[PDB]
Amino acid sequence: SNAMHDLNDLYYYAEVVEHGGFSAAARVLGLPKSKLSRRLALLEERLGVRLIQRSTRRFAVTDVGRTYYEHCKAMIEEARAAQESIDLT
């Protein structure tokens, strides 16, 4: 595996989770649902796991999906700390 394939994929996944699906995430991220849906499916295929429950009425993550998200949320918090060290200037 390569943890450095595309860091934006981890960003999008954590945001779709945080905002309960592609409807809010598209407007939170200023991106189309089509791109967000494709990247998350391609991220699942690279990781070789099932992060998302395709059977639920609403968006829902698997047990593995919840662990992966919390790691994604940590990475995002660091990237915001990087930007916040600049916003002090």
Residue 16: φ, ψ to 5°: -60, -40
Binding track, positions 14-33, relative to Cl ion; x by CB under 5 A: -------x-x----------
Q: Which does 41 bind (CB under 5 to 8 A by kind): Cl ion, a copy of itself, none?
A: none
Q: How far is CA 75 from the centre of its chain?
A: 11
Q: Tell me how far apart the alpha carbons of residues 65 and 53 are, in angstroms, rounded to a whole number.
A: 9
Binding window for a copy of itself (CB under 8 A); candidates: 16-24, 34-42, 53-61, 73-81: 73-81
Which of helix, strand or coil describes residue 70?
A: helix
Binding track, positions 34-63, relative to Cl ion; x by CB under 5 A: ----x-------------------------
CB 57 → a copy of itself: shortest distance, Å?
Answer: 26
Rule CB under 8 A: say whether 86 interacts with a copy of itself.
yes
Torsion of CA 26, 32, 38, 41, to 10 degrees: 10
